[PDB]
Design a protein around this ligand. Structure first.
Ligand SMILES: CC(C)(COP(=O)(O)OP(=O)(O)OC[C@H]1O[C@@H](n2cnc3c(N)ncnc32)[C@H](O)[C@@H]1OP(=O)(O)O)[C@@H](O)C(=O)NCCC(=O)NCCS
Ligand SMILES: CCCOP(=O)(O)OC[C@H]1O[C@@H](n2cnc3c(N)ncnc32)[C@H](O)[C@@H]1O
Ligand SMILES: [Cl-]
Ligand SMILES: [Mg+2]
Length: 633
């Protein structure tokens, strides 16, 4: 069953079926001309000459786009929209408590970004310095990000759910000189400590780069204060000049870093530069959401994730759209909250995650009870696979069967949408990301690297670069080359598996490496295992994900305790909290299976294939029977 393109969308779409085909073909056959023209979606201070200059060569990966051009991301997201749309709302902020909200015009946002840019400069921050941002979903988070970009300071945003230990890990790696946070974040009626977490992270003896902590008073809760080091947001910004001229940044100047979980090791800092990234974010946002001036757009993704960077802030603001930043959760106070927000602000485009969709779907009609939803024209899905059932429920209950759903597949490392439908150009299949975006050349290869043609399945790779591609891993280009370009020579390996049907539509099935999808969040099994083994009483651990009807995968941890230790309610709680302390609550194991029978190879390597099956229910071969019986209990 394929959903046809509705007449209302066909009548106003920026790209129709024929135009998609033509543009895609040119983007592949002649990227220099295609992207040379499309790059004009942004204002450049000095024009670029060279467009595409990339190589996926083994151990010699180099990616550059519009390299000789200069620009400023903040000028593109703010300044250039002032003359004609200064009074237009740039950000609609909806608080956790619906009684709280703000409408921030482009002019107001520009003013605050200018004041905060000067605040950073006066504090000593210069182009190239890394600034850690550990903020909740409040407008100030966007102000800080845009201000860093404006002066060329590389921001390192850290999701508020990261534990103090995880926060320290990011700061140590990036040598951030400044941390911008809030006393507390507000979510689902609860206050989440943030400042206290920063205090604890800074006590780590390995953190030596941080000289100041700017704190926003969001809740006014009693927090510890270190005079001199800590500074109040309000005190600083109110003393800064609202006058700031944007300086030109090179297309390849670093813009931001996002720590992302991988198959092995702890999170690495995926680095994005400026030019190609912004061109790609603005282009994908505009065409995939079919953005028209005046449209009210709402991405539910947290600012701490790449989706928040590209589609909550940068892509939309670059295009002059009104973007909505929601402080809370889709189902608080009630499951109808998301749709109530849609009605309250007359949202025209809604972009959310399958886990959220499934959580609302579990409440049936209570998710739409008392809501209208008529303002919606476009729906979107991101972050993980979505089954036909959830897709249809979303399409019917939320979209009232009138809105195309754009299921966008991409990753932190890709900067923007990679395989996605365009509302007025591609007919939809529930659960399918469909076709590649302009400039994207996907392929499916077997474990040997052989490309598979026609209707088939295999490892998902991208055979050439695209403007928004991550350029490296902070401080470790060698690891960047090995992680993404060594498995299949001359190709970018996504780590995902996928199938392509008879029509050429892609269906992303999920990670084929040891990366999990927990509630729409990317987590490495290795990092959870390392966290567990760090505990004084744990000798070894094997972590696998198991299917979960709501969050996609639940975390199942097989744990071997040292001799002298025994399981107990206390230890069960201590171990679960230990992971929460080492990484954060998102990585807390849902199940702890105590065992001394971990399956291993004769070389001593643990075999997770067998553990994966057992947890789902599906050197010493005797461990299998033992594990099975322990699992039964
Ligand atoms: C459906 C959903 C709202 C459910 O939220 P939930 O009921 O809090 O459950 P989660 O699994 O997200 O959270 C589990 C833990 O993380 C914590 N947590 C979640 N988000 C947090 C945040 N922004 N800051 C701090 N802590 C957070 C919770 O407090 C909880 O910890 P606790 O039990 O110790 O209090 C949520 O999982 C979601 O939005 N998922 C989709 C992710 C997404 O947008 N993906 C697209 C790619 S970004
Ligand atoms: C894109 C925002 C999240 O980026 P992250 O880097 O955190 O995670 C990327 C991974 O999320 C899944 N994923 C993401 N979007 C989809 C999607 N639309 N369908 C299926 N899986 C998806 C894929 O496995 C991919 O390797
Ligand atoms: Cl303040
Ligand atoms: Mg140990």
């Amino acid at each position: 069953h394929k959903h046809a393109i509705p007449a209302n969308i066909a009548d106003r779409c920026l790209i129709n079926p024929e135009q998609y085909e033509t543009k895609y073909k040119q983007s592949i056959n002649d990227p220099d001309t295609f992207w040379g023209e499309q790059g004009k979606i942004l204002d450049w201070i000095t024009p670029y000459q060279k467009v595409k200059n990339t190589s996926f060569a083994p151990g010699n990966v180099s990616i550059k786009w519009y390299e000789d051009g200069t620009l400023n991301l903040a000028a593109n997201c703010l300044d250039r929209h002032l003359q004609e749309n200064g009074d237009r709302t740039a950000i609609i902020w909806e608080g956790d408590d619906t009684s709280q909200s703000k409408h921030i015009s482009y002019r107001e946002l520009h003013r605050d970004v200018c004041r905060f840019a000067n605040t950073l400069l006066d504090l000593g921050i210069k182009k190239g310095d890394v600034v850690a941002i550990y903020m909740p979903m409040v407008p100030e988070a966007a102000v800080a990000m845009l201000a860093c970009a404006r002066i060329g300071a590389v921001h390192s945003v850290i999701f508020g759910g990261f534990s103090p230990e995880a926060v320290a890990g990011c700061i140590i790696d990036s040598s951030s000189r400044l941390v911008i946070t809030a006393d507390e974040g507000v979510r689902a009626g609860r206050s989440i400590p943030l400042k206290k977490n920063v205090d604890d992270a800074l006590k780590n003896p390995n953190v030596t780069s941080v000289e100041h902590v700017i704190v926003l008073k969001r809740t006014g809760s009693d927090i510890d204060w270190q005079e001199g080091r800590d500074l109040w947001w309000r005190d600083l910004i109110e003393k800064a000049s609202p006058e700031h001229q944007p300086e030109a940044m090179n297309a390849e100047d670093p813009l931001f870093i996002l720590y992302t979980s991988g198959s092995t090791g702890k999170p690495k800092g995926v680095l994005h530069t400026t030019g190609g990234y912004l061109v790609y974010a603005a282009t994908t946002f505009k065409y995939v959401f079919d953005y028209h001036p005046g449209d009210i757009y709402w991405c539910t993704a947290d600012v701490g994730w790449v989706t928040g960077h590209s589609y909550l802030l940068y892509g939309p603001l670059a295009c002059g759209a009104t973007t909505l930043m929601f402080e809370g959760v889709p189902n608080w106070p009630t499951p109808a909250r998301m749709c109530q927000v849609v009605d309250k602000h007359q949202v025209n485009i809604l972009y959310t995650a399958p886990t959220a969709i499934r959580a609302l779907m579990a409440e049936g009609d209570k998710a739409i009870e008392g809501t209208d939803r008529s303002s919606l024209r476009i729906l979107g899905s991101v972050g993980e696979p979505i089954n036909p059932e959830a897709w249809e429920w979303y399409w019917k209950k939320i979209g009232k069967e009138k809105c195309p759903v754009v299921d966008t597949w991409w990753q932190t490392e890709t900067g923007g949408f990679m395989i996605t439908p365009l509302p007025g150009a591609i007919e939809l299949k529930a659960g399918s990301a469909t076709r590649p975006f302009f400039g994207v050349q996907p392929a499916l290869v077997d474990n040997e690297g052989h490309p598979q043609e026609g209707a088939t399945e295999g490892n998902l790779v991208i055979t050439d670069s695209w403007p928004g591609q991550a350029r490296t891993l902070f401080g470790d280009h060698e690891r960047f080359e090995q992680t993404y370009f060594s498995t299949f020579k001359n190709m970018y390996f996504s780590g995902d598996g996928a199938r392509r049907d008879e029509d050429g539509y892609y269906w992303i099935t999920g990670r084929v490496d040891d990366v999990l999808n927990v509630s729409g969040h990317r987590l490495g099994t290795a990092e959870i295992e390392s966290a567990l083994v760090a505990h004084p009483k744990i000798a070894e651990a094997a972590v696998v994900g198991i299917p979960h009807a709501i969050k996609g995968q639940a975390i199942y941890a097989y744990v071997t305790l040292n001799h002298g230790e025994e399981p107990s309610p206390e230890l069960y709680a201590e171990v679960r909290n230990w992971v929460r302390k080492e990484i954060g609550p998102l990585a807390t194991p849902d199940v702890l299976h105590w065992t001394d029978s971990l399956p291993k190879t004769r070389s001593g390597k643990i075999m997770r294939r067998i553990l994966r099956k057992i947890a789902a229910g599906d050197a010493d071969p005797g461990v299998v029977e033992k594990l099975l019986e322990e699992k039964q209990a």
